Amino acid sequence: AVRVSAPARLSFTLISLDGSSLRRNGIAAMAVDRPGLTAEVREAADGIVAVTGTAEETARELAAALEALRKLWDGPAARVDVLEALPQHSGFGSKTSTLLAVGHAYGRLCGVEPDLRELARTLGRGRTSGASTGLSAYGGFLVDGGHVNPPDFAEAPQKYLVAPPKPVVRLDFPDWPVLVLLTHGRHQEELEWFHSVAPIPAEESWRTSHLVFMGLAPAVLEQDFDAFCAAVNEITFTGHFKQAQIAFQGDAVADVLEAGRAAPSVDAIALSVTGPACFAFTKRPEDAERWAWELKNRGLIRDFWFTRANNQGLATTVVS
Amino acid sequence: AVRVSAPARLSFTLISLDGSSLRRNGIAAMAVDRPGLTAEVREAADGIVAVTGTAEETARELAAALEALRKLWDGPAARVDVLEALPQHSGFGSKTSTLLAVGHAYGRLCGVEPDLRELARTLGRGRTSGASTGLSAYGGFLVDGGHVNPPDFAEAPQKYLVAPPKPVVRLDFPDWPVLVLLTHGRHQEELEWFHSVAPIPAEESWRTSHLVFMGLAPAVLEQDFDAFCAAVNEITFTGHFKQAQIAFQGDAVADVLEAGRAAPSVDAIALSVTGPACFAFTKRPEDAERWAWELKNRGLIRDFWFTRANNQGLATTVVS
Ligand SMILES: O=P(O)(O)OC[C@H]1O[C@H](OP(=O)(O)OP(=O)(O)O)[C@H](O)[C@@H]1O
Ligand SMILES: O=P(O)(O)OC[C@H]1O[C@H](OP(=O)(O)OP(=O)(O)O)[C@H](O)[C@@H]1O
Ligand SMILES: [Cl-]
Ligand SMILES: [Cl-]
Ligand code: NA
Ligand code: NA
């Protein structure tokens, strides 16, 4: 049995979504320990693939992947037990991350030492984002540079959409705690919404790159907490595309974001994609704990925990 | 004797120079083999420091640095022979690069294995740019994230100005040739000019970050030659601050840039800082050679050569 552990992906924002930029997409993101993945891959005695833990959507994709990889690497039929599943469609990058974790695990069970980028590609993942792919096996803080726009992009709708973008920035995240918040956000509809908001104005695409590459990244690099928070907040309460994500989601997340900005125990707060997960940074975590406990009791958030960044990516060890 | 070789620094552009951005400065740059530095540091028998090769400006700073480092590391008086000096104030980053090269060399002569960032700082270098500091001992292609703007930046003139910025992006440069061009550019006056052009509009600061981080860098990362050139050109013929550098310099460089854009054997061209050095990229270097030879004969450029990127930084070896 191979026992794989992997961090969740928290996303800051999408970058280039205008009708005239050289490239499209591009994502700033970081990895954290909780919520985490823990799965155990081993030989199925009867010779039939199996998947335990996790919801039906990923459960089938897990099986399809393991069926695929079986004949790819000529390995055995494998049972995987997801002991700790990453919350699905909650803004944690669960599908990409689990698939790569289990995939890498099934590889180690065989002989192979797979490349996660080509594995992601094999399994149909990372056709918009390199975030979760990058964050497996590097962890930390990264920004991928998206995809090159073809000559006939002046028209767009290619923003909606194989080749998973490599990280153009990749840094260790400082030893700062991260407060995770489960809001009452929900998870067609958005396909329609996406076309109503995008393509965004060029100025904003540019500005987002500015806040990501000349705000977030240098501050992470230099371990400047104040500078880091100033950039996280400016993205959250000001990022054109982020605002659209927030506004669409509604009061359920907006109230929590606003409360964090108000709260003096919270130095910055963010939404991860659209999914209910928000996250926050604080130099007074003891005060923040009490604030989030207060929020959870009142029923404005479902849950909260502190975690820390993962600067490794996934990790495997052989057990029995 | 320690024999040190170091690459030149070619600069693409300065990034954030507006009155309201989170950070200021920020520089995209690459390292090349020619023009290069080659120096040899050894013990001065008579016990008096000495500097041969190079112009009077760096010659004294070389000595001051070696005097400084002598009592810092309690080492011997050292003679340095600059066998191949980097052209001074020509847009090659000669001062920073030589100082760090010779400094690192004098260190190896002693016992120490110096950090180039703290060495740069010790020698008063890299108070605007991390370009040449970064490019010593990493080489390749990098972008530094500048400096954090203080609360009282709304007013500016802090854009003119110790802590040398670390590289937020650092990548191997692909195996593409680089055509270097010595134009008839010249090298107070610009101190005045700088205040007339800066601070630049915010939109442009943002846009420059966009072309650097979502243009240059991903293309370098993915080794996409067409994408790379599209971004280099957009910076050169469109970069607000770059245009100001070009326009100020005048016909001497402008004519060469325009000729490269016209020339079908040149896929992209750039100015390095303001200094006479321009550089260009081509997928038909054989045709480009003939174009530059033609230019040099007519007297529109002083000289030209092809070189390639350095992906190491400086290098030392012990000789006698
Ligand atoms: O390949 P990744 O970097 O993970 O991201 C790809 C997509 O998945 C994300 O959803 P979410 O964060 O909810 O993850 P999940 O849908 O897989 O649960 C988000 O909607 C991205 O567009
Ligand atoms: O510390 P660096 O990254 O080298 O760059 C610092 C400064 O030096 C450069 O001049 P130039 O490229 O002409 O080099 P030189 O003046 O040292 O010759 C340029 O004017 C930069 O503002
Ligand atoms: Cl804690
Ligand atoms: Cl060549
Ligand atoms: Na707050
Ligand atoms: Na051309």
Author numbering:
A (entry chain A), B (entry chain A): 11 to 171, 180 to 205, 209 to 341
The authors write:
Recent work identifying the biosynthetic gene clusters for formycin A 1,11–13 pyrazomycin 2 (also known as pyrazofurin)14,15 and showdomycin 316 has laid the foundation for obtaining an enhanced understanding of two new enzymes (ForT and PyfQ), both of which catalyse C–C bond-forming steps in C-nucleotide biosynthesis. The function of ForT and PyfQ was originally assigned based on their homology to the enzyme (4-(β-d-ribofuranosyl)hydroxybenzene) (RHP) synthase, which mediates a key step in methanopterin biosynthesis. These enzymes all utilize 5′-phosphoribosyl-1′-pyrophosphate (PRPP) and an aromatic carboxylic acid to make the new C–C bond. The liberation of inorganic pyrophosphate and irreversible CO2 release provide the driving force for these reactions. The sequence of ForT is distantly related to homoserine kinase (<20% identity), a member of the GHMP kinase superfamily, although there are regions of strong sequence conservation.
